[PDB]
């Protein structure tokens, strides 16, 4: 108990081990059943603890390594009167273990914390209540993207239809993806060299209009 | 399952309740695949029913399910809806709102009955999109984004 699983979960995993021991017993050896059953029972309980007791599942060999690291740090503190540093643990772990590896192993074994963790003595604040949402764009972000698209269309309308369409097809403002010179050239019916030349002159006219009006600089941050 | 500023993870209790449920369900499916006797399958089904109970309304029947090394009950789906902190009262019949602030009050006896005194630094932020628009209307900034960048720092405000 205490190692991450409920008493009844441990009992059921031990019962699974007991089933295995039944199906693997050999009575000719004259050993009582408990001696052979305890091995598989312990095996099943330990495998269950390794496989289930972590919200972020960690492979069983890595759990073995992390437990070994914990026990090494505990013995080192029992002999040092203080908590060990990364370097002392790396010493006591043997070859292949430096301080950075100990740090990475400790970082990789950090269990998560509950979003419903209480904040304060009154029952009206959760730890999750202070975590801002970073995924969904802000109103400022959406408005700036909208004004950016509108200013880009305002700058592309100052080109001819063909060069504006060439840039829109070459950058993905039409169908998401970016086309190749051969695709845009076969779509407009010119040579890839010609489509590249008109893309160049479109970019040049856009640079000229931008140097004149400066209506797109602030969007570049 | 979010990563906090410190790079560590914080997660909701419903995940641990679902994990309880899924572990017990899978162990039951395996115990049935093999020829497990009556006592074991009965115990497994009882634990599965109580897992569903803890998921839907924890603490409703029996001892409430907690996390290891803590006496705090895990927050189930009934707890999410019910109470002063439930969904209805906390987020649906009343919400935290934008374009809002607060400060200490002070008598103004010179005000007329229909007036109050609002600090400049409050009203700037409270009316900030209006202020960006009006700053663009006048010559104070080229566009809205430049006006916002100008208001970002206090020393850049004229």
């Amino acid at each position: 108990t205490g190692r991450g699983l409920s008493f009844l979960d441990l009992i059921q995993e031990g019962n699974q081990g007991l089933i295995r021991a039944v199906e693997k017993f050999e009575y000719k050896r004259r050993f009582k059943f408990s001696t052979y059953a305890t091995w598989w029972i312990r095996q099943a309980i330990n495998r269950a603890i390794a496989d289930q007791a972590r919200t972020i599942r960690i492979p069983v060999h890595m759990v073995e390594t992390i437990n070994k690291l914990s026990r090494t740090a505990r013995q080192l503190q029992q002999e040092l009167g203080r908590e060990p540093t990364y370097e002392e643990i790396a010493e006591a772990m043997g070859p292949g273990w430096d301080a950075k590896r100990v740090e990475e192993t400790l970082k990789i074994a950090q269990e998560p914390v509950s979003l419903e963790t209480p904040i304060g003595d009154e029952k009206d604040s959760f730890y999750g209540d202070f975590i801002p949402d970073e995924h969904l764009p802000s109103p400022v972000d959406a408005a700036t993207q909208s004004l950016l698209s509108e200013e880009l269309e305002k700058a592309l309308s100052k080109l001819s239809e063909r060069e504006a369409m060439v840039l829109k097809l070459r950058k993905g403002l039409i169908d998401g993806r970016e086309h190749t010179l051969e695709e845009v050239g076969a779509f407009f019916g010119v040579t890839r060299e010609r489509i590249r030349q008109i893309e160049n002159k479109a970019l040049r006219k856009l640079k000229y209009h931008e140097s004149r009006t400066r209506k797109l600089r602030d969007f570049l941050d | 399952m979010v990563q906090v500023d410190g790079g560590r993870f914080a997660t909701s209790d419903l995940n641990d309740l679902y994990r309880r449920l899924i572990n017990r369900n899978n162990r039951l499916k395996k115990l049935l695949a093999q020829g497990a006797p009556e006592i074991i399958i009965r115990n497994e089904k009882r634990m599965l029913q109580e897992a569903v109970d803890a998921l839907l309304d924890n603490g409703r029947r029996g001892a409430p399910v907690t996390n290891p090394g803590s006496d705090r009950p895990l927050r189930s789906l009934t707890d999410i809806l019910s109470g002063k902190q439930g969904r209805f009262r906390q987020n649906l019949l009343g919400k935290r709102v934008d374009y809002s602030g607060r400060s200490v009050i002070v008598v103004g006896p010179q005000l007329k009955l229909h007036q109050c005194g609002l600090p400049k630094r409050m009203a700037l932020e409270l009316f900030k999109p209006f202020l960006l628009k009006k700053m663009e209307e006048k010559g104070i900034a080229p566009n809205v984004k430049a006006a916002r960048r100008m208001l970002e720092r206090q020393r850049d405000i004229k």
Partner: peptide
């Protein structure tokens, strides 16, 4: 009432 008690009772039958 107590599932551990119930299981330990069912186990005491065999």
């Amino acid at each position: 009432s107590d599932p551990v008690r119930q299981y330990l009772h069912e186990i005491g039958q065999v």
